[PDB]
Amino acid sequence: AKKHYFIIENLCVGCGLCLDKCPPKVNAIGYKFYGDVQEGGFRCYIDQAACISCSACFSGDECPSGALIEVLPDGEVLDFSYTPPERLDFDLRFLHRFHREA
C-alpha cells in the first residue's frame, strides 16, 4: 500500500519494539549489527519489499527515538502519531500570596 513507514538508522536504538508489532508472516523489520550492541550496534531496518504498510510499527507509538517516520503518500514525513502542540511556557508566581516572586 501507500504511506511507507521506514526506519532511520540514525535515531534507532535497535530496541525492536517496532519489530514486536510487525506481523510474523512479513519479516519487514530486521536487525543489522556491524559491531557490538553495547554501542548501539544493533540498528533495525524495514525491508520495504516485504513491508505491507500495516501501520502496526508506527501506530503502536513505541519508537522512543523517533526513528519510525511513516512518510505520507504525497510527501509528508511524520515522526510520532500525535505531537504535543509546541506551547510557549513560563513559571506563574503570584505577587504576595502563595508565592511572592522576588
Binding site: V13, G14, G16, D20, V37, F42, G60, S65, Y82, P84
Partner: protein, 667 residues
C-alpha cells in the same frame, strides 16, 4: 515454519497488551463501576470479618470445643475486648457469652455484606432499579435518601468528584454518628468525654460526626478545586487518594504503636500477657513411633506429657511469648507496610496518569499547581539532586555510625566499645518520644530518614521522569509505555527506566527502611550489626551506654536469636522455607537473563516435541512461554517483596523476647 513460532513469542511482548492483571484498570471503569466494585469488596470484607469472628469462637455456646488461636483473630481480639464483644475471661460461663456475641456479629456481617455485595453488583451492571417499586434510580442526578436528601443536598446529586467530596464527608459523618449510636445502644458505652475508656471513642465519634457533617456542608456549598483530578479521576484522583491513604495508614500504624502500650490500653493489649494461647501449627504433644490409640491412658509409646491427649497443641504463656507486643507489632507493621505500599502505588499510578497526559500533550495543559511546579525540567533535576544528596548524607552518616559500632563491638583493628557511638543519643528535647533513649533510637530515626529518602528518589523519578528525563532529554529518547523494561544495551544499557521499574526499585529500597521497623518494634538494636553476641564487647552495650532495657540482638545476630523460636515450631519453620523459596526465585526474573530463558525454552520446546516423537507419538505443538522483562519484573517484585515479608512476619509473630533486664558487662 519459523513464523508460526514467531507469533508465539509475539504474544508476551511488552507492547500495549491486555495484561490480565489490568482487567479492572480504571481506564475501562466509570464512576458507578468503581462504586459497585468498592461496595462488593466491602461486602467481601464483611464476609471475611465474619469469618475472623467465627475463628474467634472458643466455646461454641451450643456446646463443643472451640477454635484454636490464630493471628487473623488475635490481631483483632484486643479490639473486640475493647468493644465488649470478646472477653479476657478465665471461665467458660463468661466465654460462652463472648462466643454467642461473636457468632451473632459474624451472622450480622454476613447479612450486611451480602446486601452490600448485591448493591455493588447492581452498580457494577448499571441496574439501579428498585425491584419493590419497579422504578430506576439515576446515578448522575439522584435524591440521596429522601427528605434528608432534600434538606441537605437539595436534589442535585454531585456531578463531579470535587463536588462529591462534600456529600462523601456527610456520608462519613453519617458513618461516625451511626457508629456512635451503635456503641451507645448495642455495646453499652455511653459517650463520656473521659479519654481513658472506650466511652471516649463514642464521644469522639459524635464529635467527628458533627465535624464531618459541617465540613461536608461547607464542601457541598463550596467545593474545592484540585481541578485536574476531576477529569481522569480514575487514575489522577485515585492515585492521589492512594498516596494520601498510604500516609494515613503509616500514621495509623504509629498511633497504634503508641496507644497499645499506654496504660489506658492495658485491659486490651497488656493483659494479653496474662493469657495462654493455643496457636494453630505450634508445637503439639508429640508421641513415640508405636502409638496404638486406645485413649484414656497411653499404653505403648508414652507421649511427651500425660495430659493433652494424642496430638494436642501445647500451651504457650503470654509472658514469655510477648503476645501483647506481638499483636501490637503485627498490627503496627501491617499498617505501616500497607501505608508504604499505598504511597508507592499512589506515586506509580499517578506517574501512569502523568505519562498518559505527557504523551497526548495534556501535561502542558495542566493549570493546577501540582504539575505547573514540576513542568520545569530543572526544578525536577534540582529536587531529585537535593533528595539524593540528603539521602547520601544521612545514609552514609548512619551506616558509618553502625559500622563503627560493630567494629568497636568486635574490637576489629584493636578498637573498644568505649570508642563506639554509645554517647550519640537523641537530644533531651527529643528524648520524650522514646523509652530508654539510646544510640539505638538515634540510629532508628536516621535509618528511617535514609530509607525514606532512598525510596523517595525512585518516587521522585516516577513523578518527574515518567515520559522524559534530563538524561533521556539529552539523548534522543522518550519514555512512552510506563511498563517498558528497556530500550536495549545502547548507551551501555537502558534497563528499568520506566515508572513501573522505578516503582519496583522504590519497593526494594523501602524494604530496608521498612524492615528496620520490624527490628525496632521487636527491640533489635539496629545501632550495630552484632549485639548481644559474645565475641569481644557486644554484651557491654547495656553497661557502656547505660541501657534500661535489653534488646534482642544486633542486625545480623537478630537472625540467630529469636530464630530459636521460629525453628522451635513447625509452622514458622515451613513459613521460613516457603518465604526463602519464593524470594530467591525472584533472581530467575530480575537477573538480566530473560533472553537466556527464551533461548532455553525454545530448546526445551524442541526437546519435548522431539521427545514426543522418538518415544511418544502425535504432534507436541505446545511451547513453553517465558515471562518478558515487564512480566519478569512484576513477578520478581512480587516474589521478592512477599518472600522477605513472609519472614518479617516470622520475626514479628515468633515472640517479642525483648526483656527489661540489661545484662552486666562481660568484664
Amino acid at each position: 515454519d519459523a513464523a508460526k513460532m514467531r507469533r508465539f513469542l509475539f504474544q508476551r511482548t511488552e507492547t500495549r497488551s491486555t495484561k490480565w492483571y489490568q482487567i479492572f484498570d480504571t481506564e475501562k471503569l466509570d464512576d458507578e463501576q468503581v462504586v459497585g466494585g468498592h461496595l462488593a469488596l466491602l461486602g467481601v470484607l464483611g464476609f471475611i470479618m465474619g469469618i475472623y469472628y467465627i475463628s474467634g469462637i472458643q466455646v461454641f455456646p451450643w456446646g463443643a470445643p472451640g477454635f484454636h488461636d490464630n493471628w487473623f483473630y488475635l490481631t483483632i481480639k484486643p479490639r473486640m475486648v475493647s468493644l465488649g464483644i470478646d472477653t479476657y475471661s478465665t471461665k467458660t460461663a463468661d466465654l460462652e457469652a463472648a462466643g454467642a456475641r461473636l457468632l451473632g456479629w459474624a451472622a450480622f456481617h454476613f447479612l450486611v455484606g451480602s446486601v452490600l455485595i448485591f448493591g455493588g453488583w447492581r452498580h457494577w451492571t448499571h441496574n439501579l432499579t428498585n425491584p419493590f417499586t419497579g422504578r430506576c434510580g439515576n446515578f448522575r442526578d439522584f435524591r440521596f435518601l429522601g427528605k434528608f436528601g432534600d434538606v441537605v443536598f437539595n436534589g442535585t446529586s454531585a456531578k463531579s468528584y470535587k463536588e462529591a467530596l462534600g456529600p462523601h464527608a456527610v456520608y462519613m459523618s453519617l458513618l461516625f454518628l451511626g457508629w456512635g449510636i451503635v456503641m451507645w445502644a448495642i455495646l453499652g458505652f455511653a459517650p463520656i468525654p473521659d479519654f481513658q475508656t472506650i466511652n471516649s471513642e463514642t464521644f469522639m465519634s459524635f464529635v467527628f460526626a458533627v465535624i464531618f457533617f459541617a465540613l461536608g456542608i461547607y464542601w457541598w456549598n463550596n467545593p474545592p478545586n484540585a481541578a485536574i483530578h476531576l477529569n481522569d479521576d480514575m487514575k489522577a484522583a485515585f492515585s492521589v487518594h492512594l498516596t494520601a491513604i498510604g500516609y494515613i495508614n503509616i500514621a495509623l500504624g504509629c498511633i497504634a504503636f503508641v496507644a497499645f502500650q499506654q496504660p489506658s490500653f492495658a485491659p486490651y493489649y497488656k493483659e494479653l500477657d496474662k493469657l495462654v494461647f493455643y496457636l494453630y501449627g505450634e508445637p503439639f504433644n508429640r508421641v513415640s513411633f508405636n502409638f496404638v490409640e486406645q485413649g484414656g491412658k497411653v499404653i505403648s509409646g508414652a507421649k511427651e506429657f500425660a495430659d493433652f491427649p494424642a496430638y494436642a497443641i501445647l500451651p504457650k504463656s503470654g509472658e514469655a511469648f510477648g503476645m501483647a507486643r506481638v499483636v501490637t507489632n503485627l498490627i503496627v507493621f501491617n499498617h505501616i507496610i500497607c501505608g508504604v505500599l499505598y504511597v508507592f502505588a499512589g506515586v506509580y499510578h499517578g506517574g501512569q496518569y502523568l505519562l498518559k497526559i505527557q504523551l497526548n500533550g495534556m501535561y502542558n495543559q495542566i493549570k493546577s499547581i501540582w504539575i505547573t511546579k514540576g513542568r520545569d525540567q530543572e526544578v525536577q533535576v534540582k529536587i531529585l539532586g537535593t533528595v539524593m544528596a540528603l539521602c547520601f548524607a544521612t545514609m552514609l552518616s548512619v551506616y558509618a555510625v553502625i559500622v563503627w559500632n560493630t567494629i568497636c563491638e568486635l574490637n576489629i583493628f584493636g578498637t573498644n566499645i568505649t570508642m563506639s557511638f554509645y554517647w550519640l543519643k537523641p537530644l533531651p528535647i527529643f528524648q520524650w518520644m522514646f523509652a530508654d533513649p539510646s544510640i539505638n533510637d538515634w540510629v532508628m530515626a536516621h535509618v528511617i530518614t535514609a530509607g525514606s529518602l532512598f525510596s523517595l528518589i525512585a518516587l521522585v523519578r516516577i513523578a518527574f521522569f515518567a515520559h522524559t528525563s534530563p538524561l533521556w532529554d539529552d539523548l534522543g529518547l522518550k519514555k512512552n509505555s510506563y511498563s517498558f523494561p528497556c530500550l536495549g544495551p545502547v548507551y551501555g544499557g537502558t534497563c528499568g527506566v520506566s515508572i513501573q521499574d522505578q516503582l519496583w526499585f522504590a519497593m526494594l529500597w523501602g524494604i530496608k527502611g521498612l524492615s528496620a521497623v520490624c527490628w525496632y518494634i521487636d527491640g533489635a538494636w539496629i545501632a550495630s550489626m552484632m549485639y548481644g553476641v559474645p565475641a569481644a564487647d557486644a554484651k557491654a552495650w547495656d553497661s557502656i551506654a547505660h541501657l534500661h532495657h535489653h534488646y534482642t540482638s544486633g542486625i545480623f545476630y537478630y537472625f540467630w536469636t529469636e530464630t530459636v523460636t521460629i525453628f522451635s515450631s513447625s509452622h514458622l519453620s515451613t513459613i521460613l522455607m516457603i518465604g526463602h523459596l519464593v524470594w530467591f526465585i525472584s533472581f530467575a526474573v530480575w537477573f538480566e537473563d530473560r533472553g537466556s530463558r527464551l533461548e532455553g525454552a525454545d530448546i526445551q520446546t524442541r526437546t519435548i516435541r522431539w521427545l514426543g516423537k522418538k518415544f511418544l507419538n502425535r504432534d507436541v505443538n505446545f511451547r513453553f512461554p517465558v515471562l518478558t522483562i515487564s512480566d519478569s519484573k512484576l513477578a520478581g517484585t512480587f516474589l521478592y517483596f512477599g518472600g522477605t515479608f513472609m519472614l518479617v512476619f516470622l520475626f514479628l509473630a515468633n515472640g517479642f523476647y525483648q526483656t527489661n533486664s540489661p545484662l552486666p558487662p562481660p568484664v
